[PDB]
Design a protein around this ligand. Structure first.
Ligand SMILES: *[C@@H]1O[C@H](CO)[C@@H](O)[C@H](O)[C@H]1NC(C)=O
Ligand SMILES: NC(=O)c1ccc(O)cc1
Ligand code: NA
Ligand code: NA
Lengths: 250, 28, 10
């Protein structure tokens, strides 16, 4: 996260770290949506242009964390993966359309003060809150600058951007399964996700019921925190029917 | 899922985090 | 860079 701040303890209890077993390293962010299911970006697991194709046994998820590098004894919980599910129309060949994946844990994780699931949006919450200017929150342990790494989880609040501005900021083809967020050059304030934050959550706190909803998944950006560029996020609600199909069948 | 999105150390105890008000103020 | 995690998880 660029131009963010340290999270408070328990501020993002749905935060998940995707961790490579060997070499032991941060791979991506992710989020806890139930005691057995974790949501992330498909490109965190499958990206053939970079020879990336992780299997369940390659990875662990670390839940309840605050420190990036420490083993947080008696606080974090480490879970093995039972199965990975990639969206069948995830477009890794072009523009990361439908950049979404689910991971089922081998055993349920115990909730605690530090471990708790986020809500997924309904149609009405999405329609009400996914408006230009409305702010969401992005969290992660990724790099602090494009060109270094945090001691603890970072948090930044960023406004959703009008779709024509998103489209006009890039040569990439933007789809309805993406939205973009970030400040404009003339707005003064700054902030973005960066490398290592992909797969983590963009959340909004509903003013109707005071619950946190995951509206986006950190998907892609051109650099980090560049003037005139924006971060792009998977539109969780648009893909929720797939999410529910996977959870219902498996 | 019944309790989703309600943080033990914040909403469950009626404590606010340091920047959630920024989000609320943007929901105009 | 990362602290070793317990062997049980590997
Ligand atoms: C990813 O790896 C799995 C397991 O080897 C394989 O079945 C699948 O076809 C691979 N996907 C791509 C896009 O190469
Ligand atoms: N490098 C990344 O994974 C990344 C993703 C989203 C951004 O907004 C910026 C960077
Ligand atoms: Na364009
Ligand atoms: Na920018």
């Amino acid at each position: 996260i660029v131009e963010g701040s340290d999270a408070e303890i328990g501020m993002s209890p749905w935060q998940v770290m995707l961790f490579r077993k060997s070499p032991q390293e941060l791979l991506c962010g992710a989020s806890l949506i139930s005691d057995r299911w974790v949501l992330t970006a498909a490109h965190c697991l499958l990206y053939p242009p970079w020879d990336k194709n992780f299997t369940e046994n390659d990875l662990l998820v670390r839940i309840g964390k605050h420190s990036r590098t420490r083993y947080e004894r008696n606080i974090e919980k480490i879970s093995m993966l039972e199965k990975i599910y990639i969206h069948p129309r995830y477009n890794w060949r072009e523009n990361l359309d439908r950049d979404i994946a689910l991971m089922k844990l081998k055993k349920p994780v115990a909730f605690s003060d530090y471990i708790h699931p986020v809500c997924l949006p309904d149609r009405e919450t999405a329609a009400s809150l996914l408006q230009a200017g409305y702010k969401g929150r992005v969290t992660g342990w990724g790099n602090l600058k494009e060109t270094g790494q945090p001691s603890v989880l970072q948090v930044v609040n960023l406004p959703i951007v009008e779709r024509p501005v998103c489209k006009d900021s890039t040569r990439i083809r933007i789809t309805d399964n993406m939205f973009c967020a970030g400040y404009k050059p003339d707005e003064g304030k700054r902030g973005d996700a960066c490398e290592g934050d992909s797969g983590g959550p963009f959340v909004m706190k509903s003013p109707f019921n005071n619950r946190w909803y995951q509206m986006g998944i950190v998907s892609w950006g051109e650099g980090c925190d560049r003037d005139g560029k924006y971060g792009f996020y998977t539109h969780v609600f648009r893909l929720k029917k797939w999410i529910q199909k996977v959870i219902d069948q498996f | 899922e019944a309790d989703c999105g309600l943080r033990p150390l914040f909403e469950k105890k009626s404590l606010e985090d340091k920047t959630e008000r920024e989000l609320l103020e943007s929901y105009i | 860079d990362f602290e070793e995690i317990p062997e049980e998880y590997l």
